[PDB]
Design a protein around this nucleic acid. Structure first.
Ligand SMILES: [Zn+2]
Ligand SMILES: [Zn+2]
Lengths: 55, 392, 91, 97, 76, 61, 54, 227, 35, 82, 110, 40
RNA sequence: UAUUUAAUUUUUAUAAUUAAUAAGAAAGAAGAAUAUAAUUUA
RNA sequence: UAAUAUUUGUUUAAUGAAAAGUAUUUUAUUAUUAUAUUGUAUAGUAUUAUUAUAGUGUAUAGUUUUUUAAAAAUAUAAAAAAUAAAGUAUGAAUUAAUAUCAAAAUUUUAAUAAAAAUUAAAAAAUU
């Protein structure tokens, strides 16, 4: 760095899509019909119902 | 050299031959000293640098000085404890006075009105509850004070309880006294079970099922009448069905059934017990037994509108390894939102519980998978434990 | 790897994998000559177990000691007595 | 031949008949392992059925074949079977002279 | 404002859930193997709100399943 | 004294390490005799999904 | 990309509060005894301090 | 490299994925202890690019087990830290897998990740266990009590018996955790990790033992309850 | 270049033509004219 | 029919307290400098807790001078020229 | 996977217990206000070559969380299951549509 | 234990444990009412 | 690190009317990973 | 500067150790053959540093804390091979007169001229 960056340069990084995708992003989920925990589709739990039929 | 302050907190680069400082490992900062040095304060006894002189006077005055009380005093203190009869009278009185002045909820149109908070009501009730010995829902209380009908029941049942406790003795205190050194439920206790059932009934309308089930436990604690016992056990059957406590429902479902000979012909209770027992059996996926139970209900009780409903609903519905796997009702979804394993925390990979202490997943006393400490244990210089050549 | 016990020096050979690296210098095994568990030493290197792709399998080349041991055993003079029975390529 | 999908076409047969003369010394009594698509597993299960011979694999009734490829599980069995079916007659002919 | 919660996107198109439609899951399932699990017949790439079945989409050599109207609970 | 001690310590651990070993080999052979016993009644050939004829050929063995 | 975060300018600049001369808060004799958090709009039910032992 | 054990760890599709390590030698060592552990205990909770590797390698081990050949026995014997588990591998897997040709190991991605790092957790199993001799009815939903106890058995399957030569080995291995020098190792481990300092590791005077005699006399009780 | 014509690939459909059959067919045509 | 170091020492006439001292480091038996971990050192009693000493939490790692005087340092009566 | 979210989860849970102890409704709660403001600090020595040192700053923060009740809320259905889960549960024999059972309203006649 | 129970429940005419015990205790209580009405 | 260039912002059904010398629901592995879009599989 | 560098604990032959001049052993401990008295465990170099210095004396105690799912270029070894870069967590340092910035060209002005004037044509983020 050759100079102190003002609040605008600090604020410029949040307009970027990289920032938004990394930090402020909401996850999509449903309720596991076997466990009733919030769940992302494609990720399962160690429980013998959830291994064979993985809901 | 020295692009920052000459303090031993200051930001930038320093040098040893110019700004000599000794080795301060975690030096508590300029303001507040934070949770890290305090972690050290509560575990090893002082701050990690050993320059900060441990000074705990301010908590010695808080814990040890306060509990000092000498024997000559504390041998006399329990001779002065308040009269519980009088305390029940006073608690009932001011609790009722505080509930009576709760404003009627104004009904708006097009939007729901925010109910007035029960702030002033927590203070009388918390005295009343543990003068009585039963914990009461705040939520159920507010929901009862919403409905005019429920408020009516609650109010006049409180009034009856008041009057019976003033004119008569306190029956649970009677049968507590006669226990350590049998009779039908007394007037005041009838009032009490009635108002507790009212408040649990209100507790259900707001959708707190666990709490409504927990309130009625003390409600059966206070009932010695088999009619009262039947009704209360039934009620707990249903309140534990909504809570998805299925062993609780399929416990309390059948006592309400067992009371059928000595309960009056004018009761709906035992049939409700049948319904709960059956429903609990149904929710655990055993349908055959469910239909068997409803068959028994319609055998003994002939036609019964709930057992009509449940016979035809079961009929409409018409492997052991997969049973009670399914999540059928929302309250266990709610209970699954809390107390669940999420990504990164509250799973089996973060901290594991062992004898009420926390561990890293590396020392996991129930697990030897890879990375676990117990894989590194060796044979401890006695006998070869495993035939493994290289590792262990 | 060539192995001989300390007491009777009974000679035999088996390949040693990368899993057994800690057993390479000293073995414990049952001798046919003195029958009981003995202690074996590693005199000579013979061969790998695995080989990398596009590379000859046969060159971690086993030493002259091992090839001498497979000359003395299994040789023209060694087989000639036994060829009257089997001639080992034949049954 | 080897990499054909599904049904075996007649053109494919032509391939096998061409490679019959590609190898000078062949007799119908030759070991199974000279066949297209006979692996280790495919040879072994034929052996416990007392089949060593190209003639013997050409002697199969096709319901021995399918339970070889389904109930047991030697895959690509109909390929080798059919490979026998084609080649056994020419071999006899070349054996005579 | 009304709350910022999103309604169900579980039935919409998703480009990372799109790849698993034609992918081979034989090892993932022990007892329960299904013909094609992620593949919804007649719907664009496994998404239930994208229903094409019994419309005019001309596909001479591939099958199409007929239309039955989807329930309320399957979508959201 | 410490020369003698340094060999006194390194001789007897060498002694008892064999006591570990011989009992361990004794035990492993007991174990394999248990396999020898048990695999008879269960009919385990431990030779794969192939019957006795397959190995009987000995071409594949 | 669905949430909205704009960087707060207070983290960029945090000057310390002005210290008192001889501990004399110049307006004690003028203003009320009301807690400044109350008139500011700051209120809390539970204060949970993680520097506590429990 | 087409040979169904020897591993090719690249990123190109012909190669099974290389999981991060120090050297390909180190990769081989890691893979070996993973396979050994999986053969010993049917499931592995394994993070990263390691799990697909375990899947493929387990399929290779079952293929070798189906081979049932002395060369196969020997080549599997080169590969494992356990000789005994090789015997287990040729006793169990053929009867277990006689009806299946392909994909013998089930991989299941877990929705939980290491706290330590972002790497995902996979649950790798052998497939059908109702044909297995020693793994017949076991429940893996949760772990056992103290990790030297035999794991949970399903309520409907309680009365199952296991090959004697296996529970002999298991009891011999578990019997060194009941001696008090293990307890000293346990406390001393607390001291060590606390020194290297690692949070949430209690002081060695709070560390009350994994094994007591009351717990043993109830555990053996319920163990003969399963027998 | 990220367009659809370029990124999308036809690998999955390759069973629709018999590659192995045509190679051997032109082997036949190789020995028929005698190359 | 396990190893049982005590019965192994009894079979070898090795003085079973000694035989065990072969398999722990010389720090834990004999008076010799060695790496010690401060968590082993012991702790005074807190208000919540009791005292913690290395007598109770580590009996088997403490030094024995039977072995130390009989192994390492000299006897005086062997040298007495008087 | 973030630390901040874990901390906020602890805060949410405790404030929820607080709000239930205050007598509000669980199903209608909403985060009305979430904010962070700078808290206390500890410091540390980072040792650097040629006799250079610097002070690492271990930062800490204060979190403010206000849960307010909003009776007009409606929550998006989260009970949707993907088609894959649907036909898997159908294949196993499970019902993809959960069991509702008519439950008589609790009433006390005694 | 699976077939153990499959023997148990089919000795009881397709009842379960809890239905058996429930029937039983129900009878014991109705006969307690019987003892009551015969004594009073 | 600032400018400057080069690449990228994760399948755009499609490309060029001119400048200068181009963009549809989303992230774990792009692979269920041992080059088949399932090699039959309990 | 800084959503930065660093750190990152999945498998041990560090056998040994007087020369360390710091570390609540609650009673660390003989049974002696000897007498009284005295004293036995981790801090060298600002560090739990690269890793000690030296004198003992001995050879099978494996004597048991190193993250990670593509490719450039850097570092080793044989442009292939081995290693490392989106990552969750920790979190420094050089630098800082600046306004949301300063892109291209031309001449001028007291010495590059990011100084002028004129024409002009520099979006955002990341590498
Ligand atoms: Zn689940
Ligand atoms: Zn010998």
């Amino acid at each position: 760095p050759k100079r102190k960056k003002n609040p605008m340069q600090l604020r410029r990084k949040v307009y970027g899509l990289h920032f938004k995708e990394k930090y402020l992003k909401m996850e999509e989920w449903y309720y596991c019909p076997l466990c009733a925990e919030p769940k992302k589709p494609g990720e399962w739990c160690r429980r013998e119902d959830c291994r064979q039929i993985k809901p | 050299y020295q692009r920052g302050g000459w303090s031993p907190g200051s930001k930038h680069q320093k040098h040893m031959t110019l700004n000599p400082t000794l080795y301060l490992y975690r030096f508590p900062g300029p303001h507040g000293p934070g949770p890290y040095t305090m972690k050290y304060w509560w575990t090893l006894g002082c701050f990690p640098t050993g320059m900060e002189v441990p000074f705990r006077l301010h908590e010695f005055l808080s814990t040890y000085q306060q509990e000092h009380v000498p024997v000559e005093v504390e041998e006399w203190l329990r001779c002065y404890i308040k009269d519980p009869l009088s305390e029940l009278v006073n608690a009932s009185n001011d609790f009722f006075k505080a509930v009576e002045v709760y404003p009627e909820v104004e009904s708006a149109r097009g939007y729901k009105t925010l109910q007035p908070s029960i702030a002033p009501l927590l203070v009388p009730m918390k005295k009343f509850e543990e003068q009585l010995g039963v914990k009461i829902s705040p939520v159920g209380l507010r929901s009862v004070l919403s409905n005019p009908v429920l408020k009516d029941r609650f109010l006049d049942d409180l009034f009856d309880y008041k009057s019976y406790v003033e004119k008569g003795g306190s029956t649970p205190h009677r049968r507590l006294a006669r226990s350590r050194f049998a009779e039908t439920t007394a007037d005041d206790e009838r009032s009490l079970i009635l108002l507790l059932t009212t408040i649990s009934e209100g507790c259900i309308n707001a959708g707190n099922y666990s709490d409504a089930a927990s309130v009625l436990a003390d409600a059966l604690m206070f009932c010695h009448d088999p009619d009262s016992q039947a009704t209360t056990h039934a009620n707990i059957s249903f309140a534990s069905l909504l809570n998805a406590d299925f062993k609780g429902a399929e416990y309390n479902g059948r006592e309400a059934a067992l009371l059928q000979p000595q309960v009056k012909p004018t009761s709906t209770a035992c049939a409700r017990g049948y319904v709960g027992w059956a429903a609990a059996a149904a929710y655990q996926d055993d349908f055959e037994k469910a239909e068997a139970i409803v068959k028994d209900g319609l055998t003994l009780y002939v036609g019964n509108e709930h057992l009509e409903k449940l016979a035809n609903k079961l009929q409409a519905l018409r492997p052991r390894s997969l049973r009670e796997s399914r999540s059928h009702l929302p309250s266990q979804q709610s209970r699954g939102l809390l107390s669940g394993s999420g990504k990164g925390f509250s799973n089996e990979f973060d901290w594991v519980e062992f004898k009420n202490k926390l561990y890293p997943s590396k020392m996991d006393p129930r697990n030897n998978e890879m990375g676990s400490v117990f894989r590194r244990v060796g044979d401890l210089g006695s006998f070869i434990s495993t035939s493994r050549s290289m590792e262990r | 790897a060539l192995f001989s016990c300390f007491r009777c020096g009974y000679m035999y050979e088996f390949a040693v994998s990368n899993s057994y690296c800690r057993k390479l210098t000293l073995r414990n095994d049952h001798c046919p000559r003195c029958d009981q568990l003995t202690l074996f030493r590693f005199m000579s290197v013979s061969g790998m177990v695995g080989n990398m792709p596009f590379k000859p399998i046969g060159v971690p080349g086993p030493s002259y000691a091992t090839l001498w041991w497979r000359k003395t055993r299994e040789g023209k003079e060694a087989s000639a007595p036994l060829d009257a029975v089997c001639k080992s390529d034949r049954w | 031949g080897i990499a054909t999908g599904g049904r075996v076409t007649n053109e494919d047969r032509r391939w096998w008949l061409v490679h019959l003369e590609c190898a000078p010394d062949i007799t119908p009594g030759t070991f199974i392992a000279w066949l297209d698509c006979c692996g280790t597993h495919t040879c072994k299960k034929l052996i416990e059925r007392n089949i060593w011979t190209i003639e013997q694999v050409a002697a199969l009734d096709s319901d021995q074949v399918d339970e070889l490829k389904y109930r047991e599980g030697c895959l690509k069995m109909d390929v080798v079977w059919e490979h026998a079916r084609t080649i056994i007659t020419p071999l006899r002919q070349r054996e005579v002279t | 404002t009304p709350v910022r919660d999103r309604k169900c996107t579980l039935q919409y198109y998703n480009p990372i859930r799109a790849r698993f439609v034609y992918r081979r899951d034989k090892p993932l399932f022990d007892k329960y193997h299904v013909t094609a699990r992620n593949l919804a017949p007649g719907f664009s790439r496994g998404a239930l709100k994208h229903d094409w079945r019994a419309l005019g989409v001309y596909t001479p050599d591939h099958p199409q399943v007929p239309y039955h109207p989807l329930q309320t609970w399957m979508l959201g | 004294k410490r020369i003698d001690t340094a060999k006194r310590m390194r001789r007897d651990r060498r002694r008892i390490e064999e006591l570990k070993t011989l009992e361990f080999w004794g035990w492993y052979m007991k174990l394999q005799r248990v396999r020898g016993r048990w695999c008879r009644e269960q009919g385990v050939s431990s030779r794969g999904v192939y019957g006795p004829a397959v190995d009987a050929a000995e071409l594949w063995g | 990309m669905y949430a909205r975060f704009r960087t707060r300018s207070k983290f960029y600049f945090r000057p310390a509060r002005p210290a008192l001369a001889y501990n004399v808060d110049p307006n004690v004799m003028r203003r009320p005894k009301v807690k400044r958090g109350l008139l500011k709009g700051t209120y809390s039910d539970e204060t949970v301090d993680l520097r506590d032992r429990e | 490299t087409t040979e169904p054990l020897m591993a090719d760890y690249g990123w190109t599709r012909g190669k099974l994925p290389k999981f991060r390590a120090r050297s390909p030698f180190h990769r081989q060592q890691i893979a070996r202890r993973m396979v050994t552990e999986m053969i010993r205990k049917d499931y592995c909770i394994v993070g990263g690019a390691r799990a697909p590797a375990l899947r493929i390698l387990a399929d290779h081990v079952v293929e070798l087990a189906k081979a049932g050949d002395t060369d196969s026995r020997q080549q599997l014997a080169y590969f494992l830290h356990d000789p005994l588990m090789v015997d287990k591998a040729f006793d169990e897997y053929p009867r277990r897998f006689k009806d299946m040709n392909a994909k013998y190991a089930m991989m299941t991605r877990l929705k939980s990740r290491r706290r330590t790092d972002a790497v995902a957790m996979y649950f790798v199993e052998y497939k059908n266990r109702d044909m297995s001799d020693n793994h017949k009815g076991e429940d893996y939903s949760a772990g056992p009590e103290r990790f030297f106890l035999p794991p949970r058995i399903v309520e409907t399957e309680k009365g199952i018996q296991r090959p004697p030569h296996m529970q002999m080995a298991f009891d011999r291995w578990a019997s060194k955790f009941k001696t008090e020098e293990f307890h000293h190792w346990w406390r001393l481990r607390h001291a060590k990790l606390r020194y290297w300092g690692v949070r949430n590791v209690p002081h060695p005077s709070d560390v009350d033992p994994l094994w007591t005699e009351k717990e043993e006399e109830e555990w053996h009780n319920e163990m003969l309850a399963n027998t | 270049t990220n367009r659809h014509f370029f990124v999308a690939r036809a690998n999955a459909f390759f069973s629709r033509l018999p590659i192995a059959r045509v190679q051997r067919s032109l082997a036949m045509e190789a020995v028929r004219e005698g190359r | 029919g396990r190893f049982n170091m005590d019965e192994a020492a009894a079979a070898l006439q090795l003085n079973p307290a000694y035989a065990a001292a072969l398999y722990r480091p010389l720090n834990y038996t004999f008076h010799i400098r060695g790496q010690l971990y401060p968590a082993q050192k012991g702790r005074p009693s807190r208000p919540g807790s009791l005292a913690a000493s290395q007598g109770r939490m580590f009996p088997l790692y403490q030094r024995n001078d039977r072995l130390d005087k009989e192994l390492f340092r000299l006897n005086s009566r062997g040298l007495t020229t008087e | 996977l973030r630390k901040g979210h874990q901390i906020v989860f602890r805060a949410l849970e405790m404030a929820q217990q607080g709000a239930e102890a205050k007598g509000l409704d669980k199903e209608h709660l909403r985060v009305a206000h979430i904010s962070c403001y700078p808290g206390p600090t500890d410091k540390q020595i980072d040792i650097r070559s040629k006799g250079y040192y610097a002070w690492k700053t271990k930062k800490s923060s204060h979190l403010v969380l206000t849960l307010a009740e909003d009776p007009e809320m409606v929550l998006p259905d989260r009970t949707c299951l993907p088609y894959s889960s649907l036909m898997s549960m159908k294949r196993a024999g499970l019902s993809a549509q959960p069991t509702v059972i008519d439950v008589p309203a609790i009433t006390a006649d005694g | 234990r699976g077939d153990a129970d499959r023997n148990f429940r089919e000795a009881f005419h397709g009842m379960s444990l809890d239905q058996v015990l429930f029937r039983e205790r129900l009878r014991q209580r109705r006969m307690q009412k019987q003892m009551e009405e015969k004594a009073k």
